[PDB]
Amino acid sequence: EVSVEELKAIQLRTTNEATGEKRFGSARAIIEDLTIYKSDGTTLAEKPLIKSGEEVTFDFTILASEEIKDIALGISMSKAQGGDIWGDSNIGAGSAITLRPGRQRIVYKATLPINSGDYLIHCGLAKVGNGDREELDQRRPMMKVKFWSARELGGVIHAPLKIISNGE
Amino acid sequence: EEVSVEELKAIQLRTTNEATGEKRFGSARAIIEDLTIYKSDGTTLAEKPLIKSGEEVTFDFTILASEEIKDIALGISMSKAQGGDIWGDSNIGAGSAITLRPGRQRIVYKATLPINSGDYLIHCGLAKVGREELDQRRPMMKVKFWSARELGGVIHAPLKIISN
Ligand SMILES: [Cl-]
């Protein structure tokens, strides 16, 4: 179908250097690409800004050389200078996934209450069980993303106060 | 009412929360006398010391003032352990002017807090914007967030799996 040999070559070849992506894994299957859509339906290439609190779609193209049961396809985000502020996967969602040979598309959505700033997106593909975890394709960092908001808040959590009573 | 700044400074010092090792400072021309927190089910943190990740929380402040004070900033924030604030906001950001009257009054905020499971600290500050610190409470109290839904980091934004 597609040789792991090819997937290994794909993996080594397609590595984003604008973020200094370090990429590892057995490459039995790989994250061929990730495309991110905003609520208005536009991409990051089309508009690289995400509004704080916007619903985002993560469109994964997964390319597998063979079938692989019980995988974990995860994604996370860190501040341009720091550790992860957000991370999740199908495992956290309680949703099992099995990869089939050839291309396949897995789609996640999330509403991201993240304050304005520059962040990094990471994603990872691994096999959960049968012995210990097996990393298939870990992409770190995969891409940059900037959040913007109508008004500025403290920290990273976008949770604006509602004023119920101002003693007025 | 008839409360003096002298009285408020005394209250400020003796009602500092020792459990959290609270540091408290400011002129105390007005003070944050109390903060009661309600969860979306109507229960207080005192009744049920636990907030569900992502739920709507109500902050019921009781403020004591020794005199009328215009252009007030009442801020709240949260942090984890020895870290900096992970969330913060105030009436100023929200675009709501506050003027304190003499005596006791209430200021009430809501926020929907997508904070992952863990132990956090709540900080609050009262000041007159130009800043004169009136009453800064760091940390005022502990708060525990929980969810059966587990995530990484502090941001509770669970993925939904659309297409497998
Ligand atoms: Cl309470």
PDB file of all heavy atoms in Angstrom, chain B residues 1-2 9 15 22 51 55 59 62-64 69 72 80 90 92-93 95 106 118 124 126 132 148 157 160:
ATOM      1  N   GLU B   1     -21.758  54.006  56.311  1.00  0.00           N
ATOM      2  CA  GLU B   1     -22.085  54.159  57.722  1.00  0.00           C
ATOM      3  C   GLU B   1     -20.946  54.874  58.459  1.00  0.00           C
ATOM      4  O   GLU B   1     -20.287  55.745  57.888  1.00  0.00           O
ATOM      5  CB  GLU B   1     -22.386  52.793  58.354  1.00  0.00           C
ATOM      6  CG  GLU B   1     -21.205  51.822  58.385  1.00  0.00           C
ATOM      7  CD  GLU B   1     -21.427  50.641  59.315  1.00  0.00           C
ATOM      8  OE1 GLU B   1     -22.249  50.751  60.249  1.00  0.00           O
ATOM      9  OE2 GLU B   1     -20.770  49.597  59.109  1.00  0.00           O
ATOM     10  N   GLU B   2     -20.714  54.499  59.716  1.00  0.00           N
ATOM     11  CA  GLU B   2     -19.801  55.229  60.591  1.00  0.00           C
ATOM     12  C   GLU B   2     -18.508  54.459  60.876  1.00  0.00           C
ATOM     13  O   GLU B   2     -18.004  54.485  62.000  1.00  0.00           O
ATOM     14  CB  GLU B   2     -20.496  55.554  61.921  1.00  0.00           C
ATOM     15  CG  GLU B   2     -21.970  55.947  61.814  1.00  0.00           C
ATOM     16  CD  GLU B   2     -22.170  57.389  61.398  1.00  0.00           C
ATOM     17  OE1 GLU B   2     -21.259  57.963  60.764  1.00  0.00           O
ATOM     18  OE2 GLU B   2     -23.241  57.953  61.709  1.00  0.00           O
ATOM     19  N   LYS B   9      -8.363  49.343  59.102  1.00  0.00           N
ATOM     20  CA  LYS B   9      -6.992  48.847  59.104  1.00  0.00           C
ATOM     21  C   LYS B   9      -6.842  47.745  60.147  1.00  0.00           C
ATOM     22  O   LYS B   9      -6.140  46.761  59.920  1.00  0.00           O
ATOM     23  CB  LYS B   9      -5.985  49.973  59.366  1.00  0.00           C
ATOM     24  CG  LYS B   9      -4.556  49.489  59.639  1.00  0.00           C
ATOM     25  CD  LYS B   9      -3.996  48.569  58.543  1.00  0.00           C
ATOM     26  CE  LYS B   9      -3.502  49.345  57.330  1.00  0.00           C
ATOM     27  NZ  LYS B   9      -2.706  48.477  56.415  1.00  0.00           N
ATOM     28  N   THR B  15      -8.078  39.929  60.222  1.00  0.00           N
ATOM     29  CA  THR B  15      -8.866  39.003  59.402  1.00  0.00           C
ATOM     30  C   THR B  15      -8.084  38.515  58.185  1.00  0.00           C
ATOM     31  O   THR B  15      -8.669  38.105  57.183  1.00  0.00           O
ATOM     32  CB  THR B  15     -10.184  39.638  58.910  1.00  0.00           C
ATOM     33  OG1 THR B  15      -9.902  40.698  57.990  1.00  0.00           O
ATOM     34  CG2 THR B  15     -10.996  40.174  60.078  1.00  0.00           C
ATOM     35  N   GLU B  22      -1.912  34.236  53.792  1.00  0.00           N
ATOM     36  CA  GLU B  22      -2.250  35.480  53.109  1.00  0.00           C
ATOM     37  C   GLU B  22      -1.349  36.636  53.522  1.00  0.00           C
ATOM     38  O   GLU B  22      -1.159  36.886  54.712  1.00  0.00           O
ATOM     39  CB  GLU B  22      -3.705  35.878  53.382  1.00  0.00           C
ATOM     40  CG  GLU B  22      -4.101  37.203  52.728  1.00  0.00           C
ATOM     41  CD  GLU B  22      -5.516  37.647  53.055  1.00  0.00           C
ATOM     42  OE1 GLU B  22      -6.198  36.985  53.871  1.00  0.00           O
ATOM     43  OE2 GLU B  22      -5.946  38.669  52.482  1.00  0.00           O
ATOM     44  N   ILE B  51     -15.277  23.271  42.670  1.00  0.00           N
ATOM     45  CA  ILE B  51     -15.841  23.868  41.455  1.00  0.00           C
ATOM     46  C   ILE B  51     -15.622  22.932  40.273  1.00  0.00           C
ATOM     47  O   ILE B  51     -14.522  22.425  40.068  1.00  0.00           O
ATOM     48  CB  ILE B  51     -15.221  25.245  41.122  1.00  0.00           C
ATOM     49  CG1 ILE B  51     -15.431  26.231  42.278  1.00  0.00           C
ATOM     50  CG2 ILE B  51     -15.838  25.808  39.838  1.00  0.00           C
ATOM     51  CD1 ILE B  51     -14.757  27.580  42.070  1.00  0.00           C
ATOM     52  N   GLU B  55     -17.671  25.430  34.691  1.00  0.00           N
ATOM     53  CA  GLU B  55     -18.982  25.916  35.122  1.00  0.00           C
ATOM     54  C   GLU B  55     -18.964  27.408  35.439  1.00  0.00           C
ATOM     55  O   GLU B  55     -17.900  28.021  35.587  1.00  0.00           O
ATOM     56  CB  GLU B  55     -19.498  25.121  36.331  1.00  0.00           C
ATOM     57  CG  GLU B  55     -18.963  25.529  37.700  1.00  0.00           C
ATOM     58  CD  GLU B  55     -19.736  24.860  38.831  1.00  0.00           C
ATOM     59  OE1 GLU B  55     -20.983  24.961  38.851  1.00  0.00           O
ATOM     60  OE2 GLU B  55     -19.102  24.212  39.689  1.00  0.00           O
ATOM     61  N   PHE B  59     -19.155  35.410  42.165  1.00  0.00           N
ATOM     62  CA  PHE B  59     -18.313  35.974  43.213  1.00  0.00           C
ATOM     63  C   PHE B  59     -19.061  37.097  43.912  1.00  0.00           C
ATOM     64  O   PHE B  59     -19.335  38.127  43.305  1.00  0.00           O
ATOM     65  CB  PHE B  59     -16.998  36.487  42.628  1.00  0.00           C
ATOM     66  CG  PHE B  59     -16.213  35.437  41.902  1.00  0.00           C
ATOM     67  CD1 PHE B  59     -16.312  35.304  40.530  1.00  0.00           C
ATOM     68  CD2 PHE B  59     -15.380  34.579  42.593  1.00  0.00           C
ATOM     69  CE1 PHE B  59     -15.585  34.337  39.861  1.00  0.00           C
ATOM     70  CE2 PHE B  59     -14.653  33.613  41.932  1.00  0.00           C
ATOM     71  CZ  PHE B  59     -14.762  33.485  40.563  1.00  0.00           C
ATOM     72  N   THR B  62     -18.278  41.445  49.646  1.00  0.00           N
ATOM     73  CA  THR B  62     -18.752  42.455  50.577  1.00  0.00           C
ATOM     74  C   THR B  62     -17.591  43.404  50.806  1.00  0.00           C
ATOM     75  O   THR B  62     -16.518  42.990  51.233  1.00  0.00           O
ATOM     76  CB  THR B  62     -19.249  41.847  51.901  1.00  0.00           C
ATOM     77  OG1 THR B  62     -20.314  40.925  51.626  1.00  0.00           O
ATOM     78  CG2 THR B  62     -19.768  42.929  52.834  1.00  0.00           C
ATOM     79  N   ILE B  63     -17.821  44.671  50.482  1.00  0.00           N
ATOM     80  CA  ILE B  63     -16.815  45.723  50.604  1.00  0.00           C
ATOM     81  C   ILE B  63     -17.228  46.696  51.703  1.00  0.00           C
ATOM     82  O   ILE B  63     -18.370  47.149  51.725  1.00  0.00           O
ATOM     83  CB  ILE B  63     -16.641  46.499  49.273  1.00  0.00           C
ATOM     84  CG1 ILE B  63     -16.355  45.547  48.101  1.00  0.00           C
ATOM     85  CG2 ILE B  63     -15.547  47.559  49.389  1.00  0.00           C
ATOM     86  CD1 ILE B  63     -15.152  44.650  48.292  1.00  0.00           C
ATOM     87  N   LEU B  64     -16.303  47.009  52.610  1.00  0.00           N
ATOM     88  CA  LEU B  64     -16.515  48.038  53.625  1.00  0.00           C
ATOM     89  C   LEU B  64     -15.725  49.280  53.241  1.00  0.00           C
ATOM     90  O   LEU B  64     -14.552  49.173  52.902  1.00  0.00           O
ATOM     91  CB  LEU B  64     -16.066  47.562  55.010  1.00  0.00           C
ATOM     92  CG  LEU B  64     -17.051  46.944  55.998  1.00  0.00           C
ATOM     93  CD1 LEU B  64     -16.302  46.641  57.291  1.00  0.00           C
ATOM     94  CD2 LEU B  64     -18.236  47.860  56.280  1.00  0.00           C
ATOM     95  N   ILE B  69     -15.636  56.593  47.671  1.00  0.00           N
ATOM     96  CA  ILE B  69     -14.457  56.473  46.815  1.00  0.00           C
ATOM     97  C   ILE B  69     -14.857  56.183  45.369  1.00  0.00           C
ATOM     98  O   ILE B  69     -15.401  55.118  45.064  1.00  0.00           O
ATOM     99  CB  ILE B  69     -13.509  55.355  47.300  1.00  0.00           C
ATOM    100  CG1 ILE B  69     -13.172  55.546  48.781  1.00  0.00           C
ATOM    101  CG2 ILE B  69     -12.240  55.338  46.449  1.00  0.00           C
ATOM    102  CD1 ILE B  69     -12.266  54.472  49.360  1.00  0.00           C
ATOM    103  N   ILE B  72     -13.196  52.952  41.377  1.00  0.00           N
ATOM    104  CA  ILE B  72     -12.656  51.796  42.075  1.00  0.00           C
ATOM    105  C   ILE B  72     -12.342  50.660  41.109  1.00  0.00           C
ATOM    106  O   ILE B  72     -13.057  50.454  40.127  1.00  0.00           O
ATOM    107  CB  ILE B  72     -13.661  51.328  43.160  1.00  0.00           C
ATOM    108  CG1 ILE B  72     -13.548  52.239  44.389  1.00  0.00           C
ATOM    109  CG2 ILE B  72     -13.471  49.856  43.539  1.00  0.00           C
ATOM    110  CD1 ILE B  72     -12.275  52.069  45.198  1.00  0.00           C
ATOM    111  N   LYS B  80      -1.742  28.907  40.468  1.00  0.00           N
ATOM    112  CA  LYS B  80      -1.464  27.559  40.936  1.00  0.00           C
ATOM    113  C   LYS B  80      -0.118  27.509  41.641  1.00  0.00           C
ATOM    114  O   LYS B  80       0.905  27.867  41.057  1.00  0.00           O
ATOM    115  CB  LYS B  80      -1.470  26.577  39.769  1.00  0.00           C
ATOM    116  CG  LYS B  80      -1.435  25.142  40.208  1.00  0.00           C
ATOM    117  CD  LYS B  80      -1.529  24.208  39.027  1.00  0.00           C
ATOM    118  CE  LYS B  80      -1.785  22.798  39.499  1.00  0.00           C
ATOM    119  NZ  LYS B  80      -3.145  22.666  40.093  1.00  0.00           N
ATOM    120  N   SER B  90     -11.093  42.316  36.005  1.00  0.00           N
ATOM    121  CA  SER B  90     -11.644  43.295  36.934  1.00  0.00           C
ATOM    122  C   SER B  90     -12.808  44.030  36.293  1.00  0.00           C
ATOM    123  O   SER B  90     -13.081  43.860  35.105  1.00  0.00           O
ATOM    124  CB  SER B  90     -10.576  44.300  37.357  1.00  0.00           C
ATOM    125  OG  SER B  90     -10.340  45.229  36.316  1.00  0.00           O
ATOM    126  N   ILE B  92     -12.861  47.107  35.647  1.00  0.00           N
ATOM    127  CA  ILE B  92     -12.306  48.080  34.715  1.00  0.00           C
ATOM    128  C   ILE B  92     -12.236  47.474  33.311  1.00  0.00           C
ATOM    129  O   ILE B  92     -12.681  48.086  32.337  1.00  0.00           O
ATOM    130  CB  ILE B  92     -10.905  48.552  35.157  1.00  0.00           C
ATOM    131  CG1 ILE B  92     -10.947  49.074  36.599  1.00  0.00           C
ATOM    132  CG2 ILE B  92     -10.369  49.624  34.212  1.00  0.00           C
ATOM    133  CD1 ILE B  92     -11.870  50.265  36.815  1.00  0.00           C
ATOM    134  N   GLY B  93     -11.683  46.272  33.216  1.00  0.00           N
ATOM    135  CA  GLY B  93     -11.631  45.559  31.954  1.00  0.00           C
ATOM    136  C   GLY B  93     -13.031  45.317  31.417  1.00  0.00           C
ATOM    137  O   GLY B  93     -13.285  45.440  30.220  1.00  0.00           O
ATOM    138  N   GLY B  95     -15.508  47.136  31.880  1.00  0.00           N
ATOM    139  CA  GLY B  95     -16.069  48.406  31.459  1.00  0.00           C
ATOM    140  C   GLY B  95     -17.169  48.898  32.379  1.00  0.00           C
ATOM    141  O   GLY B  95     -18.051  49.649  31.961  1.00  0.00           O
ATOM    142  N   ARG B 106     -22.258  45.477  48.465  1.00  0.00           N
ATOM    143  CA  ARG B 106     -21.921  44.262  47.740  1.00  0.00           C
ATOM    144  C   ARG B 106     -21.632  44.522  46.273  1.00  0.00           C
ATOM    145  O   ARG B 106     -22.303  45.318  45.617  1.00  0.00           O
ATOM    146  CB  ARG B 106     -23.050  43.240  47.875  1.00  0.00           C
ATOM    147  CG  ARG B 106     -23.145  42.651  49.262  1.00  0.00           C
ATOM    148  CD  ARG B 106     -24.451  41.914  49.454  1.00  0.00           C
ATOM    149  NE  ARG B 106     -24.510  40.713  48.632  1.00  0.00           N
ATOM    150  CZ  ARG B 106     -25.641  40.106  48.292  1.00  0.00           C
ATOM    151  NH1 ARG B 106     -26.808  40.598  48.693  1.00  0.00           N
ATOM    152  NH2 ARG B 106     -25.608  39.009  47.546  1.00  0.00           N
ATOM    153  N   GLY B 118      -7.519  20.592  39.783  1.00  0.00           N
ATOM    154  CA  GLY B 118      -6.340  20.855  40.583  1.00  0.00           C
ATOM    155  C   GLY B 118      -6.605  21.806  41.729  1.00  0.00           C
ATOM    156  O   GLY B 118      -7.735  22.258  41.928  1.00  0.00           O
ATOM    157  N   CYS B 124      -7.524  38.583  45.324  1.00  0.00           N
ATOM    158  CA  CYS B 124      -8.429  39.694  45.065  1.00  0.00           C
ATOM    159  C   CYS B 124      -7.738  40.990  45.446  1.00  0.00           C
ATOM    160  O   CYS B 124      -6.890  40.995  46.337  1.00  0.00           O
ATOM    161  CB  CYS B 124      -9.731  39.530  45.849  1.00  0.00           C
ATOM    162  SG  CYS B 124     -10.504  37.918  45.640  1.00  0.00           S
ATOM    163  N   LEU B 126      -8.482  45.413  45.815  1.00  0.00           N
ATOM    164  CA  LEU B 126      -9.293  46.613  45.767  1.00  0.00           C
ATOM    165  C   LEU B 126      -8.345  47.798  45.693  1.00  0.00           C
ATOM    166  O   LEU B 126      -7.419  47.885  46.486  1.00  0.00           O
ATOM    167  CB  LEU B 126     -10.182  46.707  47.006  1.00  0.00           C
ATOM    168  CG  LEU B 126     -11.254  47.792  47.037  1.00  0.00           C
ATOM    169  CD1 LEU B 126     -12.268  47.597  45.920  1.00  0.00           C
ATOM    170  CD2 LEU B 126     -11.938  47.764  48.391  1.00  0.00           C
ATOM    171  N   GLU B 132      -3.886  53.699  43.933  1.00  0.00           N
ATOM    172  CA  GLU B 132      -3.806  53.574  45.385  1.00  0.00           C
ATOM    173  C   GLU B 132      -4.320  52.205  45.786  1.00  0.00           C
ATOM    174  O   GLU B 132      -5.510  51.931  45.645  1.00  0.00           O
ATOM    175  CB  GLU B 132      -4.625  54.655  46.095  1.00  0.00           C
ATOM    176  CG  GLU B 132      -4.664  54.483  47.620  1.00  0.00           C
ATOM    177  CD  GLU B 132      -5.669  55.382  48.297  1.00  0.00           C
ATOM    178  OE1 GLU B 132      -6.181  56.313  47.640  1.00  0.00           O
ATOM    179  OE2 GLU B 132      -5.957  55.150  49.491  1.00  0.00           O
ATOM    180  N   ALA B 148     -14.295  14.949  35.879  1.00  0.00           N
ATOM    181  CA  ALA B 148     -14.021  13.566  35.544  1.00  0.00           C
ATOM    182  C   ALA B 148     -13.354  13.535  34.174  1.00  0.00           C
ATOM    183  O   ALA B 148     -12.673  12.573  33.819  1.00  0.00           O
ATOM    184  CB  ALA B 148     -15.295  12.744  35.556  1.00  0.00           C
ATOM    185  N   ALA B 157     -10.506  22.698  27.824  1.00  0.00           N
ATOM    186  CA  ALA B 157     -11.134  22.785  26.517  1.00  0.00           C
ATOM    187  C   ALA B 157     -11.144  21.400  25.891  1.00  0.00           C
ATOM    188  O   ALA B 157     -10.312  21.100  25.038  1.00  0.00           O
ATOM    189  CB  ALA B 157     -10.391  23.768  25.637  1.00  0.00           C
ATOM    190  N   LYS B 160     -13.786  17.413  21.027  1.00  0.00           N
ATOM    191  CA  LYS B 160     -14.838  16.503  20.605  1.00  0.00           C
ATOM    192  C   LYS B 160     -14.393  15.834  19.317  1.00  0.00           C
ATOM    193  O   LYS B 160     -13.897  16.483  18.395  1.00  0.00           O
ATOM    194  CB  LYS B 160     -16.179  17.218  20.434  1.00  0.00           C
ATOM    195  CG  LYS B 160     -16.178  18.437  19.545  1.00  0.00           C
ATOM    196  CD  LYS B 160     -17.568  19.054  19.563  1.00  0.00           C
ATOM    197  CE  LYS B 160     -17.708  20.222  18.610  1.00  0.00           C
ATOM    198  NZ  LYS B 160     -19.121  20.687  18.541  1.00  0.00           N
TER     199      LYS B 160
END
